[PDB]
Every structure is written in C-alpha cells, then in structure tokens.
Hints:
Order of helices and strands of chain A: HHHEEHHHEEEEEHHHEEEH
Chain A: Neuronal PAS domain protein 4
Strand order of the largest sheet of chain A: 2-1-5-4-3
Structural class of chain B: alpha+beta
Number of domains of chain A: 2
Shape of chain A: elongated
Order of helices and strands of chain B: HHHEEHHEEEEEEHHHEEE
Number of domains of chain B: 3
Structural class of chain A: alpha+beta
Largest interface: A-B, 78 and 80 residues
Number of helices of chain A: 10
Number of strands of chain B: 11
Distance between the termini of chain A: 60 Å
Keywords: protein-DNA complex, transcription
Entry title: Crystal Structure of the NPAS4-ARNT heterodimer in complex with DNA
Radius of gyration of chain A: 24 Å
CATH architecture of the largest domain in chain B: 2-Layer Sandwich
Strand content of chain A: 15-25%
CATH architecture of the largest domain in chain A: 2-Layer Sandwich
Largest sheet of chain A: 5 strands, antiparallel
Largest sheet of chain B: 5 strands, antiparallel
CATH class of the largest domain in chain B: Alpha Beta
Oligomer: heterodimer
CATH topology of the largest domain in chain B: Beta-Lactamase
CATH superfamily of the largest domain in chain B: PAS domain
Radius of gyration of chain B: 34 Å
Number of helices of chain B: 8
PDB class: transcription
Distance between the termini of chain B: 83 Å
Strand order of the largest sheet of chain B: 8-7-11-10-9
Assembly: tetrameric
Amino acid sequence: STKGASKARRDQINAEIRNLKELLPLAEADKVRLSYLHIMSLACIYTRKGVFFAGGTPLAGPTGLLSAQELEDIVAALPGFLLVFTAEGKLLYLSESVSEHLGHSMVDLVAQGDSIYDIIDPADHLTVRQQLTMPSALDADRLFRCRFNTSKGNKLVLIRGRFHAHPPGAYWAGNPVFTAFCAPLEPAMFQSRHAKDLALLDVSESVLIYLGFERSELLCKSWYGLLHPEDLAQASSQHYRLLAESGDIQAEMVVRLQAKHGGWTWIYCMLYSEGPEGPITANNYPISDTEAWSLRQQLNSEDTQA
Amino acid sequence: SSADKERLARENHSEIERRRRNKMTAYITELSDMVPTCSALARKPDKLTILRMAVSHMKSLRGTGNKPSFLTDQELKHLILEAADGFLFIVSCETGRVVYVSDSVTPVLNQPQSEWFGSTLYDQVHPDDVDKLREQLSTSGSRRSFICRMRCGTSSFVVVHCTGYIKAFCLVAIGRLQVTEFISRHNIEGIFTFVDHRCVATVGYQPQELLGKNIVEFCHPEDQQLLRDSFQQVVKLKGQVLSVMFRFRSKTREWLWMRTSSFTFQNPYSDEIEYIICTNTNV
DNA sequence: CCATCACTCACGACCT
DNA sequence: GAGGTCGTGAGTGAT
C-alpha cells in the first residue's frame, strides 16, 4: 500500500529534476523537447565539467582580450568538433559545432548515452579503448582514428589531443582528463594524384610548407624516392593490395618523409581507387612522432584480427 | 502460442525497463561519487538527498548574470590554449611590435617565450609574408583568417591559421597550427642516395660526407673488386637478400672491418630497380 | 490508415 | 516506518 508515499518520492524526484532542467544552462529552446533520462545524463555532464573547472583558477588564459561572441566565432571557424572526456569513458564537453559536421545536435546525441562508447560505432570501441588503455605520455600528444554514430556510413573522424592532470579528487584519481580536436577526414593536407608507378602527377601546393619542395620540383618524381627505408615494407604491401584488385579499393599508410632542409616529417596517407585504370587519388595528413605511434598500434591491431 | 509471444515481448519490455532503472541509478551513483558533498560519505545518502545537493551545486555554480552559457569564453579559450597544439601572441595593429606572448609557445616548437616580447614580429618572419600581413590588421573590419608563416625555436617555418578580431592599437588572434648498425640507400651503381645518422657512431662520419660518393672508394684495395662484383650479383638477384664484408674507411683512418647486407626493392608494377637498400654492421 | 516497433511516463504491489 | 526495485497498462509517436 505504498501508493501514497511512493508517489510522493517519485514526484519529489520529478520536481528536483525539473529544477535541474530549467536550471540546466542550455538554451530555452531545445530543452522543452527533451526526455527525463536525457535531462539526467545532461545534468551529470554539466556538474562533472563544472567541478573540474572550478577546482582550478584562470591562470594562463588571461581574460578580456577576447569576447564571448568572438569566442563563438572562433569555434565556428574550426574544421571539426572539440571533445573532452575521461579514459573511464565519461564525457565532459562537446561543442555544438558538431552539428555542422555530424547533423545530430549535441543535445540529441548526449541524450541516449553519457559516454564515448555511446557516440562511437561498436567496431572501433576496443581499438579506441586500446589507445585509451595507456594513461601515460603526460602532456604529450595522441592521435587515433574512429567513427561517430551518424544521423541516419558513419563518417571516419581523426582525433588528435592531449591528456592533462587530474586535480585533487577521489573520483578523478585514476581518471585524468583528455582534451582533443576532432575532424572528419574524408573531404592542413596535401592531396596526391598517383599513378600505377607510385609516381607524382599533381600535388597540393601546401606540400611547399610541409616538405619545402615546390610543386614543379616534384612533377614526375617517384614518391618511393622519399620513403624512409623502414616503413618501406608497409607501403610496399599496400601498393600490392592497391594493384592486385580491380575496383574501389581503399588503403591506409603510416610513412616517414625527408625534406629539402633535411629532417623528418611523418605522414599518414589514405588512398581510394577511382577506376581500374583511372588515377589513384590520395589524401595525406601530417602528424608528430607519437601521433604516428598510436596509429601504428591501431593499424597493427586492425591487422591482428586477420 | 501467440499468447506465449505476448509475455515474451513483455519480457523484452521488462528488460528495457530494467536497463532504464539501472541506467538512472548509474547516472545517480556517478553524480554521487562526483560532487564532493556526496563523494565522501560511504553510506551514500538516499537518492533524494543527492538530488538535492546536486540542485545545490548546479545553481551555486550558475550564479552568473548581470547558447547563453554551458561554457565560458574563459573556459573554451583555456582549453583551446592547452589543446590546439598552438600558441598565443598578441601583437600591435598600428606598428606590429609584440604585446603579449604565452609560454604555450615554449614546448610546442621549443621556442622561448618572451623573446618575441622585446622585439617586433617582422624581425624573425619571412618578409615575403609580411606584405599583406601589414595590410590585414590595418584600419580604414572582418573576421581575421590570414594565413601566416611563423618561426620555430632556435635554442635548447610553421603556419598558424590565426582567426579572431582586432582590438585596441593591437591585434589579438589565435588558432590551431595550419601545419649498433646503420641502414643506407644506394643506386644501381653504388652512390649514396640516403644514409641514416647512425654513421657518426659506426664510421665516425656525418651522413652528408658519404652522400654523393660511391662506397667502393672507402673499400680496402684487397676487397674492392670483391665488393664491386658482389653488388653486381645482388642487383640481378631480384631482391634476394645478400651480404658483403669489406673494410670500411674512416676519418679516424682506422681500418675497421665490417659486414653489409643488401638487396633490391622493386616497385611491383614497374619491376624496375627503384633503389638499393644496404644494411651495415660495424664490428 | 492502421500496424508493429521503441521510448517515456505514471502507478499499486513488492524486497530489506 | 525509508529507500529502492522489479514489474506492467495507457498514451505516444517515427518506420
């Protein structure tokens, strides 16, 4: 006969989460079109990020030099979405600009789930977790490839980011924060038009800053003549696969290239075959040392299952 | 029959509700172990109590006044400062002389912080990318997006896509950067096309000193014709891995014996010898 | 125009 | 007596 009291507790919960909803400092607009479980997950994300931020002071980001409207301008001028989360899977913050790169609004996405493993396709989960399994290389970068469930495939997105220090806290103990910029990869890039000799027809002009080599200087030069002698075998087997078949065959590659002034600049290349004889187009993206290490781990893992 | 599917689809419903309940309880328990006024008492107070203290934390944080919110200009800018792999450099809009500089330049390209301050920006910037730069922060506006090269560190160029708004004059802008052995490379004749930097410890040589020359010179007279003949075989051996042993010379003038194994890598389509890769081991 | 589907929402009964 | 949970109908839509 708990009809009376259980009702009171249920409605008490509903009232406090109504307070949460209207106090949730999101827009007056999308919130009326919400669900309760949705409101709960959203409020948890806000409280988490809030206690994280308030536990520190505004030290090295002096304020006043920028305006909040101009801040929205800045984030409107980014080629992707920002994401900050915990390695336990717990989300912290997502800029709404994700819409212009994912369609589904941020509020429509963090609704059904409150984790990275809720906005990511199953396939890459373990792989993601793998690159997240290592909680080391502090204040050093990490780079991984993964998909985000699209607004129904799910577009592959590159993620590059850095870990930071967890402030004194029993929860954040064993849980540092990870901030990262993410961007849809399939369209800071140099595009390569390659033929069946892995030669060089046309390159994006931007290679002039990536390699110090003007476009004309590369016209009709074997790109193999720029490969590190070690990842050579990887690139070779990938050319084998891109040649032995006939169709829209895709390829991935982690490589190192030299420079005019000397030195080394690792690159991550992707390829898709236009025609069985048509030119092979490719998109390249420059990375850092560890920003190739993590990719090598994910790549070899993707090859272990085979 | 169909009534057996009734309570079996009702079973699916019961399990959906089960997941709903445990999920709400999970959001609740995480909120508990998160907010400090509930992250301590191991006898976690009843769900209503933690809801109340959560209402407390949320509103006390949201006391600002006079997307509206959900991130501060301070907060977003702080994160992009420590995330974008970039740096902050306030400059002038009347002359250009550096106003403020961040220590976030310090580890990204290992550049000193306050060396820009004390100098102007055109000092260590390609004058060729100064031309319109000067005429971009100018007065008579628009959202800034001018591509600009930037110097690297010099103690122990890169393009930054600086977007923003000019200010009082001065210019404030930010953005993510718009970006024991040795193995070598030979031609079909034997000229160094590439050589790793480990030569300083295997032959006592910087790599450029061997790049542009043929190995056969640095081979001992008693071993020269051997090594030549050997590579002649290894070429037509279709990349089958192969080794040679010759007395590599040295600027130390010490005759050191060593072994080198080499084979050919052929672009599988062209089948033409594109380069020769030689592994070398100093003993 | 319903027809199976998930998803959200209340409610009396039910552990401890 | 408090706190919480496993369960269902009635109404509600997107597919």
